[PDB]
Short mmCIF file of C-alpha atoms in Angstrom, two decimals:
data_model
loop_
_atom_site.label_atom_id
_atom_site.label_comp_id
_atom_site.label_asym_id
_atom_site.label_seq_id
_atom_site.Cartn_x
_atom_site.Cartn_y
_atom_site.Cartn_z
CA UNK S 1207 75.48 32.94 145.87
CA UNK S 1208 79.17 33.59 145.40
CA UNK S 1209 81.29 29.95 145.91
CA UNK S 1210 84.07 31.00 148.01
CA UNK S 1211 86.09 27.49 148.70
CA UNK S 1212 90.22 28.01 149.71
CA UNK S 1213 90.99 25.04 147.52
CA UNK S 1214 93.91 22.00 147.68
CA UNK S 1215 94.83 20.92 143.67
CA UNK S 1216 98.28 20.34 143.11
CA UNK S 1217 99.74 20.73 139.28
CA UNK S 1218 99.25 17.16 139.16
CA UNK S 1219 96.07 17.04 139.81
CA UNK S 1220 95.22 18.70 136.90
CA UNK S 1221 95.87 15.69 133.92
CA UNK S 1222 98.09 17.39 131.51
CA UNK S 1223 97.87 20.57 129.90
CA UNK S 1224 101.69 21.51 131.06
CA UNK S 1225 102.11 23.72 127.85
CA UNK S 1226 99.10 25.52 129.89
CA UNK S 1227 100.40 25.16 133.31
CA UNK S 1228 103.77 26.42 131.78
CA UNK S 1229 102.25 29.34 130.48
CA UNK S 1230 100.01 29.76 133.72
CA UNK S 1231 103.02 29.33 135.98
CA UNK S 1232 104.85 31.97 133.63
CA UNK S 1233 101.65 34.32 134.14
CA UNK S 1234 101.09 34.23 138.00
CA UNK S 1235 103.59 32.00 140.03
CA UNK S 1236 106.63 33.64 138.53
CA UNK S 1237 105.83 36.91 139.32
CA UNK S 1238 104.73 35.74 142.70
CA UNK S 1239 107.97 33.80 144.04
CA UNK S 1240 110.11 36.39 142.51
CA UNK S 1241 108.75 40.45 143.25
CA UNK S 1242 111.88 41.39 143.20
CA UNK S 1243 112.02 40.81 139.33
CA UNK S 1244 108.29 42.09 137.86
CA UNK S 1245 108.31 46.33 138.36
CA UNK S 1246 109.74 49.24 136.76
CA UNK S 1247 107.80 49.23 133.65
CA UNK S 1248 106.25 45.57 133.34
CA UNK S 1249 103.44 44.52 135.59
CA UNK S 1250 101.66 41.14 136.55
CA UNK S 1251 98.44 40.46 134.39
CA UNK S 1252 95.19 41.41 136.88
CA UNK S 1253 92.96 39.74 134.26
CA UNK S 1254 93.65 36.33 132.11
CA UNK S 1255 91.15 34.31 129.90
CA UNK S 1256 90.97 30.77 129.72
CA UNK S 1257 89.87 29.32 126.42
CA UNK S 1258 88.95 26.62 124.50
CA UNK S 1259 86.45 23.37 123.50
CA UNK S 1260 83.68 22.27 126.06
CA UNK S 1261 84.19 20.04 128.15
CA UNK S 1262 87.64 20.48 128.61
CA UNK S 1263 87.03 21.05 132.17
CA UNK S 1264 89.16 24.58 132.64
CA UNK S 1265 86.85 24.76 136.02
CA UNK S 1266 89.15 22.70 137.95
CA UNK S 1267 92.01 23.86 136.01
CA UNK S 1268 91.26 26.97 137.95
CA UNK S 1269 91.22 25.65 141.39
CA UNK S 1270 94.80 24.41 141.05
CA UNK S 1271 95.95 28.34 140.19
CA UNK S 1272 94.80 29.19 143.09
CA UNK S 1273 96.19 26.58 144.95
CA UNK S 1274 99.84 26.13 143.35
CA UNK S 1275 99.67 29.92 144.07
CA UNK S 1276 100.23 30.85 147.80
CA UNK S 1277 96.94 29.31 148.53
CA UNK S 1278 94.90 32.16 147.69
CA UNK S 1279 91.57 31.90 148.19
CA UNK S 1280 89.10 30.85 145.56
CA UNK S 1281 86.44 33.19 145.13
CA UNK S 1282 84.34 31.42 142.23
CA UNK S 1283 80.66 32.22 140.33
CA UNK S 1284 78.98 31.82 137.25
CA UNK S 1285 77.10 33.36 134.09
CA UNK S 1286 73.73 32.17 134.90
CA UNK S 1287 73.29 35.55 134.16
CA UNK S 1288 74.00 35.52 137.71
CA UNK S 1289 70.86 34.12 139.55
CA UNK S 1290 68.50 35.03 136.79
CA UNK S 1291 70.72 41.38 140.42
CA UNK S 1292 73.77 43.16 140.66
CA UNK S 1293 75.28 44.03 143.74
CA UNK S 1294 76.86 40.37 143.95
CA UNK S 1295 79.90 41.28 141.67
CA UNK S 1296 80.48 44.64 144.10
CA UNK S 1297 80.75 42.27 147.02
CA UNK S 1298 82.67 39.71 144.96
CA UNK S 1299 85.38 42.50 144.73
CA UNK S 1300 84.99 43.65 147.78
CA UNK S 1301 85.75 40.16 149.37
CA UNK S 1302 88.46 39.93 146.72
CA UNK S 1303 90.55 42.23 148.65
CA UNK S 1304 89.32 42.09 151.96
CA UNK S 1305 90.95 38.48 152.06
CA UNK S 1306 93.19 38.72 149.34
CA UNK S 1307 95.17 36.69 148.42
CA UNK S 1308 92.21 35.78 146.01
CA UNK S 1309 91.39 34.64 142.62
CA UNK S 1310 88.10 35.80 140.79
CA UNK S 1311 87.01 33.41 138.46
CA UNK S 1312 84.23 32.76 136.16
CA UNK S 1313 83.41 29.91 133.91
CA UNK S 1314 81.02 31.14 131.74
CA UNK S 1315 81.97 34.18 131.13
CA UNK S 1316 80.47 35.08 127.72
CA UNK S 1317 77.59 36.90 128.12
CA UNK S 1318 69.94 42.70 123.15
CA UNK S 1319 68.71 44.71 125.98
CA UNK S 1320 72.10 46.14 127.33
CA UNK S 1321 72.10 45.24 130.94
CA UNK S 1322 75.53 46.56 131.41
CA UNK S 1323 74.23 47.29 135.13
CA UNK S 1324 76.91 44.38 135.54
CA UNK S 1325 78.33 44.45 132.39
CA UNK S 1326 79.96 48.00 133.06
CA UNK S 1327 80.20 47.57 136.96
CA UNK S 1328 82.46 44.36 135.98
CA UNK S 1329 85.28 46.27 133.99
CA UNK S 1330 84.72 49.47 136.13
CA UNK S 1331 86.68 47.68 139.01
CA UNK S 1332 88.62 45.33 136.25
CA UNK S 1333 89.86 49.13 135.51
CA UNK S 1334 89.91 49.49 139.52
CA UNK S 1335 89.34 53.15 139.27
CA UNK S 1336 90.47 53.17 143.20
CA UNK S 1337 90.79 50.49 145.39
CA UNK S 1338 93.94 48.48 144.82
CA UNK S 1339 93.61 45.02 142.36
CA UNK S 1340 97.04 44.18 143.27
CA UNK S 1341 97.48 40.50 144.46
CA UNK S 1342 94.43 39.57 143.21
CA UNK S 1343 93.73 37.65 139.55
CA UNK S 1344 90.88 37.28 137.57
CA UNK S 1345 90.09 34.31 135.39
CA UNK S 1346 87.40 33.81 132.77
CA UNK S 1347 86.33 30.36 131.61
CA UNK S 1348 84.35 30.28 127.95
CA UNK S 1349 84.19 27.53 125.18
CA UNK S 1350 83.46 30.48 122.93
CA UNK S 1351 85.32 33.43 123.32
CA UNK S 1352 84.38 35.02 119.99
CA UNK S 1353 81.13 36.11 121.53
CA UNK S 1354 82.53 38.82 124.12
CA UNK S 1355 82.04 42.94 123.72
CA UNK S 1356 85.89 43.87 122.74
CA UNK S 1357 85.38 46.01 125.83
CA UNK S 1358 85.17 42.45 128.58
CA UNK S 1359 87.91 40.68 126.09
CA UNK S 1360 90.39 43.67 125.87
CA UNK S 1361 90.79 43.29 129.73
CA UNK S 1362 92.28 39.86 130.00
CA UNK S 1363 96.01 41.15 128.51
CA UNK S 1364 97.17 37.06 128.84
CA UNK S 1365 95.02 34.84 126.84
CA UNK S 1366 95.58 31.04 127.16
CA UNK S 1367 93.87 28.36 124.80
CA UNK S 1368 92.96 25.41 126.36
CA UNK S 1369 93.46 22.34 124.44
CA UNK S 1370 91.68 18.68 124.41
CA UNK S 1371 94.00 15.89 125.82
CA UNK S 1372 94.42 12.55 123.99
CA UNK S 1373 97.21 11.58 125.72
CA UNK S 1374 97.42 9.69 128.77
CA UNK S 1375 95.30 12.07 130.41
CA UNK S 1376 92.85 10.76 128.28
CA UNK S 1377 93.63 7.22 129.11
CA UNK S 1378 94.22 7.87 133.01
CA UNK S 1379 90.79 9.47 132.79
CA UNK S 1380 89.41 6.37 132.50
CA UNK S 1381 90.62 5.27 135.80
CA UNK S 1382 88.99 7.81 137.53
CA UNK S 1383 85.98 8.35 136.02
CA UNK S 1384 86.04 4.14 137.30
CA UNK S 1385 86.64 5.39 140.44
CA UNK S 1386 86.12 2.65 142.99
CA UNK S 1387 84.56 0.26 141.33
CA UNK S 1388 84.65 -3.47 139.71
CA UNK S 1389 86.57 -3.99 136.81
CA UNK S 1390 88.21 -6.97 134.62
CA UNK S 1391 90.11 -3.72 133.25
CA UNK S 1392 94.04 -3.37 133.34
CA UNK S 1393 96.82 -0.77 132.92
CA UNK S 1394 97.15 -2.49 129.37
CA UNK S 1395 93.41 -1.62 128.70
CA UNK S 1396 93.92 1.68 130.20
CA UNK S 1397 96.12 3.08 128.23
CA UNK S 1398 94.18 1.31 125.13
CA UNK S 1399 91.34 3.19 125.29
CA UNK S 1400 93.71 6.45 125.72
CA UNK S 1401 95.28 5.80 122.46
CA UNK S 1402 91.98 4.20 120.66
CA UNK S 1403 91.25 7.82 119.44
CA UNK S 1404 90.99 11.18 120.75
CA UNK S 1405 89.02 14.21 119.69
CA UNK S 1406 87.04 13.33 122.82
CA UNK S 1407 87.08 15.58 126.42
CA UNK S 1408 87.04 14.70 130.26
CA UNK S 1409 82.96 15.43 129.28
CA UNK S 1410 82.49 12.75 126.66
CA UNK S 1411 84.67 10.41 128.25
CA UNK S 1412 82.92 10.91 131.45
CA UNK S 1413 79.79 9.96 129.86
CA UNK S 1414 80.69 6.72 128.13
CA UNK S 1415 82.30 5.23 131.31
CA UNK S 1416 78.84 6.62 132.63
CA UNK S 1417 77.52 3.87 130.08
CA UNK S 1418 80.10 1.49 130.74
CA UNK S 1419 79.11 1.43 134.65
CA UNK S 1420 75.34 -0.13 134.08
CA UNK S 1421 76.09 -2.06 131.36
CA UNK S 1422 76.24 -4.88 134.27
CA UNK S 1423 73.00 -3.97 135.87
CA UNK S 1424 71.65 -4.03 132.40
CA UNK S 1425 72.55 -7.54 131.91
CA UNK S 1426 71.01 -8.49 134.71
CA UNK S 1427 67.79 -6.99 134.70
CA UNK S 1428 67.50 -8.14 131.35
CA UNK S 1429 69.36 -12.01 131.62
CA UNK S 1430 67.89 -14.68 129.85
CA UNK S 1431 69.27 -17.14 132.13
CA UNK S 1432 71.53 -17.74 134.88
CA UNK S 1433 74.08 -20.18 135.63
CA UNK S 1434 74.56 -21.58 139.46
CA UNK S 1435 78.19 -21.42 141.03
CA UNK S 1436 80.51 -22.04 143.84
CA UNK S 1437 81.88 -19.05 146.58
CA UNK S 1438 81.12 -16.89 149.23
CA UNK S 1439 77.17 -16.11 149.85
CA UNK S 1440 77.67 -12.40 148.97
CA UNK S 1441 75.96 -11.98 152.51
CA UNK S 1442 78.73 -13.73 154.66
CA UNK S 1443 81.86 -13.95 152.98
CA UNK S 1444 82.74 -16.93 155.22
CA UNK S 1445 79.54 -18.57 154.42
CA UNK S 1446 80.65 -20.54 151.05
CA UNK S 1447 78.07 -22.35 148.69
CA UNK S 1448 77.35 -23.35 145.74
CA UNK S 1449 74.27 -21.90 144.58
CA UNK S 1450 75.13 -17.91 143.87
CA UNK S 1451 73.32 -17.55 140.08
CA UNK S 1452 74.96 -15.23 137.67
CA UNK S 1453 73.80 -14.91 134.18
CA UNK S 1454 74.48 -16.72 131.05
CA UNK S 1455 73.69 -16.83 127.39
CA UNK S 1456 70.39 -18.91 126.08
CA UNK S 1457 72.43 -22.13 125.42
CA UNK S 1458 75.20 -22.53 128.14
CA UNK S 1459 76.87 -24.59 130.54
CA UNK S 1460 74.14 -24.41 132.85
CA UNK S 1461 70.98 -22.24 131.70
CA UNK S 1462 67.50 -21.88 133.03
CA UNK S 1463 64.82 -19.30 132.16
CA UNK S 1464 65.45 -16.87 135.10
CA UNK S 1465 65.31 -13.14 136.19
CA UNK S 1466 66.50 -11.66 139.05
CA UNK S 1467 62.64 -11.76 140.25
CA UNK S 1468 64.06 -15.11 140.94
CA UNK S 1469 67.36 -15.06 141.37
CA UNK S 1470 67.83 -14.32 146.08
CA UNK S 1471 69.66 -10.95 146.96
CA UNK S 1472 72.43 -13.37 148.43
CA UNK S 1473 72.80 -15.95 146.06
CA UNK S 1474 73.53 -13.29 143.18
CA UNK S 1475 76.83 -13.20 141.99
CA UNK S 1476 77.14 -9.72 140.19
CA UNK S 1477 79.23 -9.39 136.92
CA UNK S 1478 81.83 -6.35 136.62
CA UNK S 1479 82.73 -3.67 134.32
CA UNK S 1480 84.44 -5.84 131.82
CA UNK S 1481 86.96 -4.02 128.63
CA UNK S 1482 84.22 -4.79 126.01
CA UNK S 1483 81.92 -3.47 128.47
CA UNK S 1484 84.38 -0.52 128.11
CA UNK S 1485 84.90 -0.67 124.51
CA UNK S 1486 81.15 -1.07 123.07
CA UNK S 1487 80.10 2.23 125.03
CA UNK S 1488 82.53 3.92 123.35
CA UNK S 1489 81.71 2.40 120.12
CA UNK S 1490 78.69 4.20 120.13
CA UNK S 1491 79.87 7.47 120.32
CA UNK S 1492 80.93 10.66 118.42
CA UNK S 1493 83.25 13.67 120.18
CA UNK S 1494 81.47 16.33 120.87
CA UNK S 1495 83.77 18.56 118.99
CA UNK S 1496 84.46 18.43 115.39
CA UNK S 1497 87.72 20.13 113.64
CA UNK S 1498 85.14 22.72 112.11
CA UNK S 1499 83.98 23.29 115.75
CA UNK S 1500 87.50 23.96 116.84
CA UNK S 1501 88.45 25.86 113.87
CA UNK S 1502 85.82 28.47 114.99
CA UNK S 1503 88.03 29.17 117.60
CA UNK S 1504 91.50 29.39 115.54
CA UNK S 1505 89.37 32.79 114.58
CA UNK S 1506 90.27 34.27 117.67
CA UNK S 1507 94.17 34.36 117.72
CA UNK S 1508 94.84 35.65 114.20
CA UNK S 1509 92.31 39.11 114.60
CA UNK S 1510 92.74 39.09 118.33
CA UNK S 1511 95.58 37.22 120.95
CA UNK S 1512 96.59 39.88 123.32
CA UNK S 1513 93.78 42.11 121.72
CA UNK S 1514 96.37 44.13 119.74
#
């Protein structure tokens, strides 16, 4: 039910978003390596909000708070109106404490028939009417934040948006949404596809390198011909030949009306992710966020920020 994972992601881990990590650093880690300088009539925010477009993955973002942060532990859920009934987010409290240090978090945190069984329960022990919140944080995660009961957003005193990269976050997500795998692709084309626009999110460029990845098994499922060649039998890398059949275009330097039907598991010489490969997904795609989609946001800080 409730994720409870003591997490390892360094600052760097996290591609980017330093003007974030600044002000998350400012927010928590300050106040943590120096006690000595947060008491006497300013205290450490209990309760921050993390906001901004989808698919900007603030998820992870969390894990590294909680790691770049004494190693508390990560005590983690979500708003699926939790397990589509209650008792879980006493618990989740309970826990926080009993092995503090700790970090609530929820992604998904916007949420009639008032079912504030939760709803109130939540900010009852936000308010802690007893028991001690002290070295314990909570984090919300929402890609709209406009749709919260003033009550649930007045709590989070910090509130920090969370832009889209387009940077070379953007480009070195490439690389690892490539993860291990065959590619014609270089640092040069890397940092190419970074630059060749922006607007788009770890999401949708995860799901164009998601195209990207079959367009090889694409081609040869559907080849119109293959062409024979010379190396290693792709089953014994010592046993070289001259026979492996990749495929080729109608009228080529070698064609003949095959299909992998045809073409023997070993004598296949698989093509790889190539940059056009690359490029073509991507020229087939719109981001998933629109400057009218992220103006609906902009709402927020001008009749809100620190609610205040």
């Amino acid at each position: 039910a409730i994720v409870i994972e003591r997490p390892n992601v360094k600052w760097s881990d996290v591609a980017g978003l330093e003007g974030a990590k600044e002000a998350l650093k400012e927010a928590v880690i300050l106040p943590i390596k120096f006690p000595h300088l947060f008491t006497g009539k300013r205290t450490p925010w209990r309760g921050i909000l993390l906001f901004g477009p989808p698919g900007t993955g603030k998820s992870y973002l969390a894990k590294a708070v909680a790691t770049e942060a004494n190693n508390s532990t990560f005590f983690s859920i979500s708003s699926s109106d939790l397990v589509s009934s209650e008792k879980l987010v006493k618990n989740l409290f309970q826990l926080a404490r009993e092995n503090k240090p700790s970090i609530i978090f929820i992604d998904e945190i916007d949420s009639s028939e008032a079912a504030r069984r939760i709803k109130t329960e939540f900010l009852v022990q936000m308010q802690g009417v007893g028991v001690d919140n002290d070295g314990i944080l909570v984090l919300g995660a929402t890609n709209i934040p406009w749709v919260l009961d003033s009550a649930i957003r007045r709590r989070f005193e910090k509130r920090i948006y969370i832009p889209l990269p387009e940077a070379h976050a953007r480009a070195a997500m490439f690389r690892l949404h490539l993860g291990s795998t065959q590619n014609s692709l270089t640092e040069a084309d890397f940092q190419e596809l970074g630059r060749k626009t922006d607007g788009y999110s770890g999401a949708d460029i995860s799901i164009i390198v998601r195209d990207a990845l079959m367009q090889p098994v694409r081609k040869v499922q559907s080849a119109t011909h293959f062409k024979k060649v010379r190396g290693p039998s792709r089953a014994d890398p010592n046993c070289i030949v001259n026979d492996l059949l990749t495929p080729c275009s109608p009228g080529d330097p070698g064609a003949i009306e095959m299909t992998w039907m045809d073409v023997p598991g070993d004598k296949l010489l698989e093509p790889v992710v190539s940059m056009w490969d690359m490029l073509r997904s991507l020229s087939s795609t719109k981001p998933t966020v629109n400057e009218q989609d992220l103006l609906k946001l902009k709402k927020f800080t001008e009749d809100f920020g620190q609610e205040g």
